[PDB]
Amino acid sequence: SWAQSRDEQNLLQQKRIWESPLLLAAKENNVQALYKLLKFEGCEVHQKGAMGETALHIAALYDNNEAAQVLMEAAPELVFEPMTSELYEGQTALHIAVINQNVNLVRALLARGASVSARATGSVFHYRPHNLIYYGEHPLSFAACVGSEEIVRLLIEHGADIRAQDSLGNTVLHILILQPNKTFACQMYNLLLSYDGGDHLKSLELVPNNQGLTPFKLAGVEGNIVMFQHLMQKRKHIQWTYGPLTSTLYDLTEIDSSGDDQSLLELIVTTKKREARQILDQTPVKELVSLKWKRYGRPYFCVLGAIYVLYIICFTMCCVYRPLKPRITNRTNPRDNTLLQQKLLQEAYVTPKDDLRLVGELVSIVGAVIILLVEIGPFHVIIVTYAFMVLVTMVMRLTNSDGEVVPMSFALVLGWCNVMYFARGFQMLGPFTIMIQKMIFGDLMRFCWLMAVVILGFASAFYIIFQTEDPDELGHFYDYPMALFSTFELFLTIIDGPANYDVDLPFMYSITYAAFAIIATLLMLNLLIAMMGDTHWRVAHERDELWRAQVVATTVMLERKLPRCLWPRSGICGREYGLGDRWFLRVEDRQD
Template sequence: PAIRKLLTDGICDIYQRGAVGETALHVAALYDNVEVAVTLMEAAPELVNERMTSELYEGQTALHIAAVNQNITLVKALLKRGANACTAQATGHFFRRSSQNLLYFGEHVLSFAACVGNEEIVQLLIESGADIRAQDYLGNTVLHILVLQPNKTFACHMYSLILSYDRNKEGPGSLELIPNNEGLTPFKLAGVEGNTVMFQYLMQKRKHNLWSFGPLTTVLYDLTEIDSWAEDQSFLELIVSTKKREARQILDLTPVKELVSLKWNMYGRPYFCFLALFYILYMVCFTMCCVYRPLKPRTGNKTSSRDNTIYVQKMLQVLFPVALSDILRVGAAKYFGQTILGGPFHIIVITYACMILVTMVMRLTSTTGEVVPMSFALVLGWCNVMYFARGFQMLGPFTIMIQKMIFGDLMRFCWLMAVVILGFASAFYIIFQTENPENLGQFYNYPMSLFTTFELFLTIIDGPANYDVDLPFMYSVVYFAFAIIATLLMLNLLIAMMGDTHWRVAHERDELWRAQVVATTVMLERKLPRCLWPRSGICGREYGLGDRWYLRSVLF
């Protein structure tokens, strides 16, 4: 009655908006007041599709709010009076997917209703014209958005409900096969997010029971989107490259576990062992060429000193295009940053190739000093042998442990170490700057002071002392402070940091091993010719299931 009185008296502007761009109808929907909402719509029908205008809630309509509140009566009233269930999109910052937002329901009314799990409202919206194929600013359909919901039980139920309205669910234009902006279908997104519940649910929908005998059942698992043999963006590669640890649990689920085991045992392990043996033989030959390279005495030198020069031929024109194609396919951040994918080793092998190339150029142009890139190449080449440890379960996790310690603990520690060394090296240099250089020559020159302080920091040498002369008193004071800070505190801090990394990696030992096997298998499968790596599984034509490929598994 009060609303009707205000409207008839003309005291209030029915189109007035609030602080966040909301109308009176938005407020009525927010408080689930159906009577007021109906009154407002009768007085001003154009309010039905009015959207909020603030940056935070831009695009939200009363139908969005009613669907989230699961007010079926209000939803019916809004649809009856012309509410648009298809084109209304909530695009405000509040509805964007980010680490700051607590929810992500997409933009469309249908996805809002699906995410809160109200089956009746979802059916009503679809029957009223809501587009089940609508995509938001990330390219996510309602199925993508359901995969991202924390309540996985009702998400699976709503997934099947919405899919039942897809008229082309068996064809190439199926709703399940629509990719988002990152090229991920809902199935691949479940893998990247580590949603094991949704993954198992979708796999159960895809399997076909072949025959049963008592407790024994033979099933065929659809390998579409799973098998990397025919996929540009491999599901297996996506799992091992994601930062979510939960995703690696999928590698232990059927049929992924069986598929990886089949690929690795039949082709991956033999090829990888052959590649490791070939690389070691190559490094032995390269080392022998460097050690026994032709030398000649220096001109005018009566000693036996010799110049270290040699030209080692290596077909580099193949390495760089192959590496470049992988970088473009998976991205530089994943290619170089993911330890499971061998990121640091990619840096090593590319740098090694560059050193070989520099050595060749210097040799061809008769430039002296080629021993520098050659020595770097030898160190990097032999360090890269550790990459092949991933082919062995006992050694594989330790390579990841070393990488995490170097690029995690050691990199952070180096910043602290640099500050300490710069400070104390400068102090030592200042103390001996006006002293006789014969008193303590290790600190008379500033570069030598830095190097000597670095050696002291790592306890490579004992504290330099000259007992034939009286050293400055401040030297003893500064050296005492340096010994306490560097040796007792910082080195033990580094040991503690590395111990923590070892503990964490040790608890993920089995997961890391499986992830390394998958990454190595996918890498070999992409590099080798198809004739050397046949497709795994069974073609569905043998069982009247079309052109899809399946993996046969026996369940008890």
């Protein structure tokens, strides 16, 4: 494994420190032992350790300015030495002093003339979840993250480029957004903007990430509210203050769906970050998305819903009124238990009342392909498998298979269960269907493994009990799978429970069923108690917040496909008003 290699390598490093008396004196800060190993008896002063480290690298890991200066005065070429290992490919003695906030050592390293543009491209500095931190690659990025503002400016004084980016295309501004201490990073964020070129163009705040992401836009996708609020101050204009009233004008540029994909709204709903959902509730955004839904958002959803309501009620109209026949096959020739009246008409006549079904079946297929034309959570796979069954039913049609009902049956339930997709938004039943959206694809698929286990124990027993018996009376279990299906219904207390009082029931049934009825209710009551985990207040607020998320996700969805002659752009543009042609949303609020 990779996690054990670094565990072994870190253990392997301490061995080379103990063995090499130079690195041992560099670790323990033994000043007298260094002059004994350098000036008197010349040791290998460029001694590479297990992690490709020098004696100075060890003298910097443990804050030892004395042992560092003895190594720099007796060998001033160890300063430029980078780590020559795989885990630490690139790290130098300045990176270690900047991390440990050793200002006097950074001062002495910069007096010696160390590199202020050395990258630490080792695997331990990569942005991975198994790495506990991520401060970038450059020494300026290390100083900004640890919060040492004295070292930050001290590095700029010696020629540190704020523009420089790492292997992931992140400037020093992008790295500060991925940090825990947000309340102190806002002060650090302003400090690095002060060293910008001063020109309105080619600003550091506009340098994009390699995935097309500005520092402002990254704060929303990552869920950093403190940096989102702080970055919002730079892009909002107050119009006037009238006592308690204050009408402020927000910029509304990267926070709107104007680019083909560069949009902060399109990144909040698509990302899986549970934190980013709180950014559309922020005071520049929540005003926007509320107006997008109250007008032109909510009505178009009802139109698309009502159209889908009629389209599905038409498909059912074609099923209830389909071909007929009082059964051309002879009689109950296979087994006597058979109630079949096959309703298959391969002919295209019956013109009186069949011409209505002709256009009805034509509507169902051109709508099913339109559903697929616009496709070429869970309600997404339901609507596509529905239209797949329509074409398979159309393929089952014109071939006239005896299994003409099996593909047509799935399209019934999938067609309506996808109209409760429109429960999203619309009213206050949206959070109810997002509560079952988690239920069907969360606990259900796991909870059934425990219920099928209890069934396959009692069902495979009840069949043995009534295998000796006669299925003609009390035939709840007669087949191998029909014993499972009857016990399945018995687990939910739907069937009356096998009870024939004229005959004599086997002695094992009256014992096994008593144990089944108790265990089945305990599994059902404990299932109800397990539902109480989502009943504390936050969970009622969580699903109600997740409901607004999929409402905003629907609002952005309708704006993309719908035309532009309807649905005007958000805000009032910067033309015809003395603005910068960018949009703006006038939002006035009242304090207290």
